[PDB]
């Protein structure tokens, strides 16, 4: 039947504890989270149409205790609406607790809480970068495959009040109309090339004019004038993206026409970066809240 409130309560019990303390749900509880959230994802559009006010977060990458701190600053649900831009698993020590809390909040408040797909919500990536190993050690392989079946149904992009375009990676040279996003059928894997790939993998680059090759070996880079023509063609004010670690937790691009959000401080036990969360009120007036390392 899925005791959501008991799951959420145990996930929050370690709030304020020796950072790194595990929450070991049962296998059936986690599978219930995956099966229920998967239903909700498929029942909602692959291109979300959201409305302010809300708070937007970037990569978490298994830093569960930093995620709990974000909620302390911005208000635990349902006090605030939330949109996460992807990359919940891999790299960090506690991907499981991270993704379970987010899925539980998705099930609990399916209209005030939203999760986008990042490039790490993909079996071929998170098999390698930590999530699979965490599943093997703490549960079993079959649970990882259940997570994959859920990740394959995550929405890809969101538009907030018809003026803010949100995705994990960035723009595609194959993105002519938002209909190409709505057309993608779920469940799906992330292809090695094309629109869905670029939406999860591409980066902005100040030294590129049109489209350049991406250092990652996947997808493309895009320049400041690609942003302008996109925003103008689709009557938008801002592109909100993640996917890239940034010193301040946020970083503007192309005269504040694009912003990069990263929410995991001291990423990979390195960098000494900070994390940021972007608050949007109902007027579409936007601000940043900074999460410094701890």
């Amino acid at each position: 039947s899925l005791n959501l409130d008991s799951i959420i309560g145990r996930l929050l019990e370690v709030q304020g504890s020796r950072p790194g303390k595990n929450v070991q749900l049962t296998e059936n509880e986690i599978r219930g989270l995956c099966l229920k959230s998967r239903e909700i994802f498929l029942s909602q559009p692959i291109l979300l149409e959201l409305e302010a006010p809300l708070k937007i977060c970037g990569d978490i990458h298994g830093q569960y205790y930093d995620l709990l701190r974000l909620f302390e600053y911005g208000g635990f649900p349902p006090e605030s609406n939330y949109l996460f831009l992807g990359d919940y698993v891999d790299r960090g020590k506690q991907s499981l607790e991270t993704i379970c809390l987010l899925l539980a909040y998705k099930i609990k408040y399916p209209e005030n809480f939203f999760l986008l797909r990042g490039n790490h919500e993909c079996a071929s990536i998170n098999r390698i970068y930590g999530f699979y190993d965490e599943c093997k050690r703490r549960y079993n392989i079959k649970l990882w495959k259940t997570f994959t079946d859920c990740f394959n149904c995550l929405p890809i992009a969101a538009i907030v009040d018809e003026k803010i375009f949100c995705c994990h990676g960035g723009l595609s040279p194959d993105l002519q109309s938002m209909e190409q996003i709505r057309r993608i059928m779920r469940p799906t894997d992330v292809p090695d090339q094309g629109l869905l790939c670029d939406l999860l993998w591409s980066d902005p680059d100040k030294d590129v004019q049109g489209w350049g090759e991406n250092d990652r070996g996947v997808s493309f880079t895009f320049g400041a004038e690609v942003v302008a023509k996109f925003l103008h063609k689709h009557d938008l004010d801002l592109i909100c993206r993640a996917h890239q670690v940034v010193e301040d937790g946020y970083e503007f691009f192309a005269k504040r026409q694009l912003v990069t959000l990263f929410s995991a401080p001291n990423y990979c036990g390195e960098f000494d970066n900070a994390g940021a969360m972007m608050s949007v009120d109902e007027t579409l007036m936007c601000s940043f809240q900074i999460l410094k390392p701890a």
């Binding site: 980066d203 890239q244 192309a254 390195e270 601000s287």
Partner: peptide
């Protein structure tokens, strides 16, 4: 509506902030 920014938000596009991709 229109996206505007609060008076305390700093524009850091040209301030030489560090960025990175993989670890």
């Amino acid at each position: 509506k229109k996206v505007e920014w609060t008076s305390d938000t700093v524009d850091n596009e040209h301030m030489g902030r560090r960025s990175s991709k993989c670890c």
